[PDB]
Design an enzyme around this catalytic site. Sequence first.
Site, PDB file in Angstrom:
ATOM      1  N   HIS A   1       0.846  -1.190   0.000  1.00  0.00           N
ATOM      2  CA  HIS A   1       0.000   0.000   0.000  1.00  0.00           C
ATOM      3  C   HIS A   1       0.884   1.244   0.000  1.00  0.00           C
ATOM      4  O   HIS A   1       1.709   1.436   0.897  1.00  0.00           O
ATOM      5  CB  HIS A   1      -0.991  -0.014   1.170  1.00  0.00           C
ATOM      6  CG  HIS A   1      -1.965  -1.152   1.130  1.00  0.00           C
ATOM      7  ND1 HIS A   1      -2.160  -1.970   2.228  1.00  0.00           N
ATOM      8  CD2 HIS A   1      -2.765  -1.575   0.122  1.00  0.00           C
ATOM      9  CE1 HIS A   1      -3.065  -2.859   1.857  1.00  0.00           C
ATOM     10  NE2 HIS A   1      -3.457  -2.662   0.598  1.00  0.00           N
ATOM     11  N   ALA A   2       0.729   2.054  -1.051  1.00  0.00           N
ATOM     12  CA  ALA A   2       1.501   3.251  -1.379  1.00  0.00           C
ATOM     13  C   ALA A   2       1.745   4.256  -0.240  1.00  0.00           C
ATOM     14  O   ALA A   2       2.892   4.631  -0.013  1.00  0.00           O
ATOM     15  CB  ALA A   2       0.852   3.954  -2.548  1.00  0.00           C
TER      16      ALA A   2
ATOM     17  N   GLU B   1       1.592   3.950   3.011  1.00  0.00           N
ATOM     18  CA  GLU B   1       2.156   3.371   4.239  1.00  0.00           C
ATOM     19  C   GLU B   1       3.686   3.460   4.231  1.00  0.00           C
ATOM     20  O   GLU B   1       4.372   2.443   4.256  1.00  0.00           O
ATOM     21  CB  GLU B   1       1.644   1.927   4.416  1.00  0.00           C
ATOM     22  CG  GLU B   1       0.124   1.853   4.500  1.00  0.00           C
ATOM     23  CD  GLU B   1      -0.517   0.483   4.403  1.00  0.00           C
ATOM     24  OE1 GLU B   1       0.215  -0.531   4.416  1.00  0.00           O
ATOM     25  OE2 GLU B   1      -1.761   0.426   4.287  1.00  0.00           O
TER      26      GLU B   1
ATOM     27  N   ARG C   1      -3.439   4.648  -2.188  1.00  0.00           N
ATOM     28  CA  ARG C   1      -3.310   3.299  -1.635  1.00  0.00           C
ATOM     29  C   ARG C   1      -2.995   2.218  -2.673  1.00  0.00           C
ATOM     30  O   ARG C   1      -2.078   1.417  -2.474  1.00  0.00           O
ATOM     31  CB  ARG C   1      -4.595   2.942  -0.847  1.00  0.00           C
ATOM     32  CG  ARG C   1      -4.771   1.462  -0.476  1.00  0.00           C
ATOM     33  CD  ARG C   1      -6.149   1.218   0.118  1.00  0.00           C
ATOM     34  NE  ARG C   1      -6.408  -0.190   0.440  1.00  0.00           N
ATOM     35  CZ  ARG C   1      -6.021  -0.792   1.562  1.00  0.00           C
ATOM     36  NH1 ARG C   1      -5.295  -0.137   2.460  1.00  0.00           N
ATOM     37  NH2 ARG C   1      -6.329  -2.063   1.781  1.00  0.00           N
TER      38      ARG C   1
ATOM     39  N   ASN D   1      -3.531  -6.057  -2.087  1.00  0.00           N
ATOM     40  CA  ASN D   1      -3.892  -6.909  -0.958  1.00  0.00           C
ATOM     41  C   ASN D   1      -5.346  -7.437  -1.014  1.00  0.00           C
ATOM     42  O   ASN D   1      -5.839  -7.988  -0.028  1.00  0.00           O
ATOM     43  CB  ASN D   1      -3.582  -6.217   0.368  1.00  0.00           C
ATOM     44  CG  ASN D   1      -2.801  -7.100   1.314  1.00  0.00           C
ATOM     45  OD1 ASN D   1      -2.096  -8.033   0.908  1.00  0.00           O
ATOM     46  ND2 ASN D   1      -2.901  -6.819   2.599  1.00  0.00           N
TER      47      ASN D   1
ATOM     48  N   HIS E   1       2.970  -3.396   6.821  1.00  0.00           N
ATOM     49  CA  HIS E   1       1.973  -2.380   6.535  1.00  0.00           C
ATOM     50  C   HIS E   1       1.903  -1.374   7.687  1.00  0.00           C
ATOM     51  O   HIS E   1       2.654  -1.470   8.657  1.00  0.00           O
ATOM     52  CB  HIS E   1       0.593  -3.063   6.403  1.00  0.00           C
ATOM     53  CG  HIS E   1       0.420  -3.938   5.199  1.00  0.00           C
ATOM     54  ND1 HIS E   1      -0.409  -3.567   4.157  1.00  0.00           N
ATOM     55  CD2 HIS E   1       0.926  -5.166   4.937  1.00  0.00           C
ATOM     56  CE1 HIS E   1      -0.360  -4.563   3.286  1.00  0.00           C
ATOM     57  NE2 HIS E   1       0.437  -5.543   3.709  1.00  0.00           N
ATOM     58  N   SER E   2       0.971  -0.419   7.575  1.00  0.00           N
ATOM     59  CA  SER E   2       0.645   0.570   8.597  1.00  0.00           C
ATOM     60  C   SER E   2      -0.804   1.024   8.350  1.00  0.00           C
ATOM     61  O   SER E   2      -1.276   0.921   7.226  1.00  0.00           O
ATOM     62  CB  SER E   2       1.621   1.746   8.571  1.00  0.00           C
ATOM     63  OG  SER E   2       1.271   2.775   7.660  1.00  0.00           O
TER      64      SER E   2
ATOM     65  N   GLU F   1       0.949  -4.513  11.073  1.00  0.00           N
ATOM     66  CA  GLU F   1       0.420  -3.161  10.929  1.00  0.00           C
ATOM     67  C   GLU F   1       1.200  -2.340  11.942  1.00  0.00           C
ATOM     68  O   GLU F   1       1.055  -2.550  13.148  1.00  0.00           O
ATOM     69  CB  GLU F   1      -1.094  -3.125  11.211  1.00  0.00           C
ATOM     70  CG  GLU F   1      -1.943  -3.849  10.176  1.00  0.00           C
ATOM     71  CD  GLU F   1      -2.011  -3.227   8.793  1.00  0.00           C
ATOM     72  OE1 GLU F   1      -1.833  -1.994   8.672  1.00  0.00           O
ATOM     73  OE2 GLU F   1      -2.268  -3.978   7.825  1.00  0.00           O
TER      74      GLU F   1
HETATM   75  C1  LIG Z   1     -11.939   1.718   4.334  1.00  0.00           C
HETATM   76  C2  LIG Z   1     -10.580   1.062   3.996  1.00  0.00           C
HETATM   77  C3  LIG Z   1     -10.247   1.525   2.560  1.00  0.00           C
HETATM   78  C4  LIG Z   1     -10.549  -0.479   4.192  1.00  0.00           C
HETATM   79  C5  LIG Z   1     -10.762  -0.649   5.709  1.00  0.00           C
HETATM   80  C6  LIG Z   1     -10.022   0.572   6.295  1.00  0.00           C
HETATM   81  C7  LIG Z   1      -9.450   1.299   5.047  1.00  0.00           C
HETATM   82  C8  LIG Z   1      -9.050   2.751   5.367  1.00  0.00           C
HETATM   83  C9  LIG Z   1      -8.282   0.417   4.424  1.00  0.00           C
HETATM   84  N1  LIG Z   1      -7.175   0.072   5.341  1.00  0.00           N
HETATM   85  C10 LIG Z   1      -6.010   0.840   5.459  1.00  0.00           C
HETATM   86  O1  LIG Z   1      -5.824   1.864   4.803  1.00  0.00           O
HETATM   87  C11 LIG Z   1      -4.953   0.356   6.484  1.00  0.00           C
HETATM   88  C12 LIG Z   1      -5.013   1.164   7.815  1.00  0.00           C
HETATM   89  C13 LIG Z   1      -6.355   1.387   8.512  1.00  0.00           C
HETATM   90  C14 LIG Z   1      -6.261   2.499   9.554  1.00  0.00           C
HETATM   91  C15 LIG Z   1      -7.573   2.734  10.303  1.00  0.00           C
HETATM   92  C16 LIG Z   1      -8.084   1.454  10.950  1.00  0.00           C
HETATM   93  C17 LIG Z   1      -8.199   0.335   9.924  1.00  0.00           C
HETATM   94  C18 LIG Z   1      -6.880   0.115   9.181  1.00  0.00           C
HETATM   95  N2  LIG Z   1      -4.990  -1.086   6.738  1.00  0.00           N
HETATM   96  C19 LIG Z   1      -4.755  -2.050   5.764  1.00  0.00           C
HETATM   97  O2  LIG Z   1      -4.541  -1.789   4.563  1.00  0.00           O
HETATM   98  N3  LIG Z   1      -4.808  -3.365   6.278  1.00  0.00           N
HETATM   99  C20 LIG Z   1      -4.555  -4.552   5.464  1.00  0.00           C
HETATM  100  C21 LIG Z   1      -4.777  -5.781   6.380  1.00  0.00           C
HETATM  101  C22 LIG Z   1      -4.446  -7.083   5.678  1.00  0.00           C
HETATM  102  C23 LIG Z   1      -4.623  -8.310   6.538  1.00  0.00           C
HETATM  103  C24 LIG Z   1      -4.836  -9.574   5.729  1.00  0.00           C
HETATM  104  N4  LIG Z   1      -4.045  -9.661   4.502  1.00  0.00           N
HETATM  105  C25 LIG Z   1      -5.606  -4.585   4.342  1.00  0.00           C
HETATM  106  O3  LIG Z   1      -6.770  -4.253   4.424  1.00  0.00           O
HETATM  107  O4  LIG Z   1      -5.106  -4.992   3.163  1.00  0.00           O
HETATM  108  C26 LIG Z   1      -9.081  -0.841   3.881  1.00  0.00           C
HETATM  109 ZN   LIG Z   2      -1.496  -1.842   4.109  1.00  0.00          ZN
END
Ligand SMILES: CC1(C)[C@@H]2CC[C@@]1(C)[C@@H](NC(=O)[C@@H](CC1CCCCC1)NC(=O)N[C@@H](CCCCN)C(=O)O)C2
Ligand SMILES: [Zn+2]
Length: 305
Positions: free
Chosen positions: A64-65, A67, A122, A139, A192-193, A266
């Site tokens: 994810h870009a 992060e 992202r 992802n 990730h973050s 994360e």
């Molecule tokens: C609305 C969203 C676009 C959706 C849910 C929160 C978002 C901001 C975004 N998620 C994100 O941008 C980040 C950070 C968010 C910060 C606020 C709380 C929730 C996380 N998490 C993420 O990519 N997790 C990975 C976890 C992978 C685990 C298994 N491979 C993923 O989703 O790929 C995805």
């Molecule tokens: Zn991520």
Amino acid sequence: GHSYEKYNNWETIEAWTKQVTSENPDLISRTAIGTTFLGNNIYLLKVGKPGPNKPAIFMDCGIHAREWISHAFCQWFVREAVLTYGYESHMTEFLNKLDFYVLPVLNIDGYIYTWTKNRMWRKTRSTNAGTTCIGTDPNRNFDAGWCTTGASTDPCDETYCGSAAESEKETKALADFIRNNLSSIKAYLSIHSYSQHIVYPYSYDYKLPENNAELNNLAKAAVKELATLYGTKYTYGPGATTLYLAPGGGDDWAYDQGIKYSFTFELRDKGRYGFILPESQIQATCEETMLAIKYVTNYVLGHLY
Ligand SMILES: CC1(C)[C@@H]2CC[C@@]1(C)[C@@H](NC(=O)[C@@H](CC1CCCCC1)NC(=O)N[C@@H](CCCCN)C(=O)O)C2
Ligand SMILES: [Zn+2]
Ligand SMILES: [Zn+2]
Ligand SMILES: [Zn+2]
């Protein structure tokens, strides 16, 4: 000018992958595992003391870009490996017995876009049919319960699954590499973050993995090791159970390939700065993450299969 305590652009990271390999030829080798949508080389660093029939650990950053701390961590891992090999017992043993396949930036196109046009980008930078909306979530692009609930069928969405599983050149390059080196890869780590969470399978459905008890205990112990340095609090558990449904993830795909030690890290923080984590926090975040990564590495080494 490259610095481990600053966020570096792709031109700087790419130049660093070449320089760190040439400066450490007995510990690092560099290959291009493929090209991005825009034609950028996807570099992979093989970190470890060369030897025959060596098991390996695969680690990727920058899926994810936005992060930026994840891209910074992959560089810090390599920094630690070249600085402490021969100076610290654990890192020395790790590089002698295992190889680390470190992918510093998976989504290069998206990363360039965060530096040039949109800091909060992202997804990838690939085109979509019937719309001007750009990118697929890498992802949500792996072939593991691909495009089910938790992924979007809408190309304009942040969790867009893509036209097909592995439709993205970046996802296909990573998956092809792991498939070609499956007999050697014992662990998969995705950096990730943010949220301060350690995720393990499954995320594509509400189901616990075969070695759930083992992964629960390992994540618990890695979280404990991480907290010893600054008291940073991390939560852990199966993806769907403790975070949300996120189908088509690299960690679930790697697990279903037989890599039983699969984790998503994360990193910092919990929402104060979010993706815009200050440069002043790179050192602290990376040093504490090193403790969790080294704990997992030591465990994998003691539980070879
Ligand atoms: C609305 C969203 C676009 C959706 C849910 C929160 C978002 C901001 C975004 N998620 C994100 O941008 C980040 C950070 C968010 C910060 C606020 C709380 C929730 C996380 N998490 C993420 O990519 N997790 C990975 C976890 C992978 C685990 C298994 N491979 C993923 O989703 O790929 C995805
Ligand atoms: Zn991520
Ligand atoms: Zn250190
Ligand atoms: Zn044991």
